[PDB]
Amino acid sequence: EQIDAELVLSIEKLQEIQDDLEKINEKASDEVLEVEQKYNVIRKPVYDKRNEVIQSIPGFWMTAFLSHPALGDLLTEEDQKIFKYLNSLEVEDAKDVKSGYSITFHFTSNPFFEDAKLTKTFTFLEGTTKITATPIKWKEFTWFTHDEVADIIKEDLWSNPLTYFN
Amino acid sequence: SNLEQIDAELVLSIEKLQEIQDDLEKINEKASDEVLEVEQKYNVIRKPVYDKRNEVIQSIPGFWMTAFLSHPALGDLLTEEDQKIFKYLNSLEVEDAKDVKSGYSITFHFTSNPFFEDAKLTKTFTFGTTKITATPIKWKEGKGSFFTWFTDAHDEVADIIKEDLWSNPLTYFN
Amino acid sequence: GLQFPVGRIARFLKAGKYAERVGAGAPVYLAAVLEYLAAEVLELAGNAARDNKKTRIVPRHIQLAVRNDEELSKLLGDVTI
Amino acid sequence: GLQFPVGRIARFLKAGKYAERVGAGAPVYLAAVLEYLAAEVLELAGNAARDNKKTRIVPRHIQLAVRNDEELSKLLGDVTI
Amino acid sequence: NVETYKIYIFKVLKQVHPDIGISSKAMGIMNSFINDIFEKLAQESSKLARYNKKPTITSREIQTAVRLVLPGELAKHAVSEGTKAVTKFTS
Amino acid sequence: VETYKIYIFKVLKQVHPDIGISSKAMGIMNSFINDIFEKLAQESSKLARYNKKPTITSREIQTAVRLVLPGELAKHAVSEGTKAVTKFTS
């Protein structure tokens, strides 16, 4: 029975190796997320110098949103007027990039709603997530408490809105 | 008037936005490049561990066989003839291209049997665009599935071998 | 007093994988050169406005501005509207 | 000739986030210590296995081997089975 | 690839010939030229910097030298100062 | 949690070569060594931060070689010196 014992030694050695791979993949995918965070810093002041230069282009956020293959059709005419006051859109991964992010929507003088935003924040760490969204202050949008819309705003439009605008 | 001022700054601003977007592409190139540098550094750390695992599994007869079978998704793609061949299935190997982006092979190493010639059924995926390449199933002289998979042809078989089984096969085995 | 974007050029050189390292003086020297050449095609293709008694510089005005100056032809080659 | 794994323990200190740096004195030094603390709780637990008249150590053998020696009950504790 | 130098074409036009404009395809032919020279120059310069095997001292090297040689906060200040001098010389 | 079970087994085969060990029993010895390592590590980790003096490790000797030596000499210089340290560090 020289290889009854030596067959367990082999199966636990194998357990050692899957033990240490889980460590090396954690360093690796940790160094990966140090790089994500580095670049969010680098991107912020450029995203900020974009938002500001966009303020001197008249219909940019509305024109962009609409022009999009996906996002365009959902906006109905009532939304679209309010959307003519849609001076900015603001995506930003929160500082600990892995946790979450928020999709603010800026606005200006318009009677229907006095709210100065319509954010839709997120936090996840991946089996369980969550969504806390601005309550709509209709003065004197079927979104706000899987998700496809938030993805296409974070990853596609926010990324490059000018592609759609043309 | 001021009306001239704004029509110019509309011309100016619209290109300063085409710059910002032109120059954000070069910033994402430079960032997603350092991520592949990370993925490279690590394929290099893991090659010696993924090796000494090969070594260890040679001292467990029919490990990968039982692992393959014990997976829910890879388990019920076979039938009887496949399983007899699988007695002689004494190794697996899933190594990436030396630049991670290009691709990866998936080589089913083998041992002696009157059921085919080759000592490895390789299948590589080369990218930049996508194209499959495979080893020909040199059925032995008495002519004779999972081995349909070795066409030279959006592939759920590999996205389970490289991302579950090869990652940690010991979990399935138990 | 360079109009051309010293910073933006330093990126074009590095992100273009021309070399892996770029001295601070290189995009500055390249910046002034690209501008000097601009000042030359602009001097001339804006003088092709006065010769042609026009002011909006069009695909045309440049083309005759290049073929008249010897060097600027051999550099930029033939020009077609 | 140490039995215990210097490299694997070196990694456990780094990944453990106990310190980002380690001089290879420590994993060696620490490995030697976990080897001696096993080579006590075995030279005792294994004696226990010949008291209760066996050659297969089990929780009852380790519990008795610990609690009887003073130092190892202070170190380890009750050993509830 | 093609970059926009168009902002900085305009800004040059308004020096040599203040009172003269330029049509859309006329600017898209000035740009077409600066992009053609940038390649010719960078690609050439890339052959020149790859011929040469002699190592260069840039600011990256000086800045690392500050950290290794200077102690602690002296060093963090020194880097701020050096980085601020080079950034001003580039602007 | 972590596996020292290959070495707990291997030590057992020198003090009492004549005796095996169960699963609940190994699993309790394996828990013992985990428990000690954790107490020792958390202690060394405070005692590292207490005595914050600058320290020369192989890390630094490596980079010093890379910095001080010419291109080809350094490559061997390192390899030789990495062997020296990996020798019984496993």
mmCIF file of C-alpha atoms in Angstrom, chain B residues 11-12 15-16 18-19 22-23 25-26, chain E residues 1-8 11 31:
data_model
loop_
_atom_site.group_PDB
_atom_site.id
_atom_site.type_symbol
_atom_site.label_atom_id
_atom_site.label_comp_id
_atom_site.label_asym_id
_atom_site.label_seq_id
_atom_site.Cartn_x
_atom_site.Cartn_y
_atom_site.Cartn_z
ATOM 1 C CA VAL B 11 -16.884 76.026 -34.563
ATOM 2 C CA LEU B 12 -13.902 76.064 -32.025
ATOM 3 C CA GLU B 15 -13.394 70.484 -32.795
ATOM 4 C CA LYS B 16 -12.026 70.843 -29.179
ATOM 5 C CA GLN B 18 -13.309 66.013 -31.594
ATOM 6 C CA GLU B 19 -9.785 66.465 -29.997
ATOM 7 C CA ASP B 22 -9.563 61.681 -30.504
ATOM 8 C CA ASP B 23 -7.215 61.935 -27.409
ATOM 9 C CA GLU B 25 -9.042 56.870 -27.584
ATOM 10 C CA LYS B 26 -5.201 57.151 -27.194
ATOM 11 C CA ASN E 1 -5.526 57.394 -38.132
ATOM 12 C CA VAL E 2 -5.940 61.131 -38.795
ATOM 13 C CA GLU E 3 -5.655 63.862 -36.101
ATOM 14 C CA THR E 4 -7.190 67.389 -36.089
ATOM 15 C CA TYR E 5 -4.684 70.314 -36.079
ATOM 16 C CA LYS E 6 -7.550 72.521 -37.406
ATOM 17 C CA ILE E 7 -7.911 74.795 -34.307
ATOM 18 C CA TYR E 8 -4.141 75.626 -34.655
ATOM 19 C CA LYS E 11 -4.956 80.410 -35.145
ATOM 20 C CA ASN E 31 -5.168 69.076 -42.046
#
